[PDB]
């Protein structure tokens, strides 16, 4: 509910980071 709702949130955050360019984006990896 909180621990299992933060990992689905981290995966959205990870996909968003990948969308921006991943390593090439300049933004640090999410979690």
């Amino acid at each position: 509910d909180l621990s299992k709702q933060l990992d689905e949130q981290c995966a959205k955050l990870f996909i968003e980071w990948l969308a921006a360019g991943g390593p090439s984006s300049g933004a640090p990896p999410p979690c």
């Binding site: 990992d7 981290c10 995966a11 996909i15 969308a19 360019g21 390593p23 979690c31």
Partner: protein
Amino acid sequence: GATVSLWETVQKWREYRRQCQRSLTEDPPPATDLFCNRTFDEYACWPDGEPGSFVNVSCPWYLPWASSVPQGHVYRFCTAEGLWLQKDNSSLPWRDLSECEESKRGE
């Protein structure tokens, strides 16, 4: 249990990169002189493009919500100059990710 989890999503991404970088280096050259070159942009695997056309690939199978977007496609435009399109004031090339995004509550 309900979430795919950060570990399983990143692990599935690593395998998608692994299969991509395999194809990128073992797939036979097009042998048609002008074409946009194959690439892995961190998100998707792109093949060699045909000039003056739109190139499409399925939504990357590692996506948490991949099940929710199975007829989806991510797009690029390969120019006549054998170059992947890049719009005014940009560095990352033109791409339509639309059919592959999540979308909120309902069903």
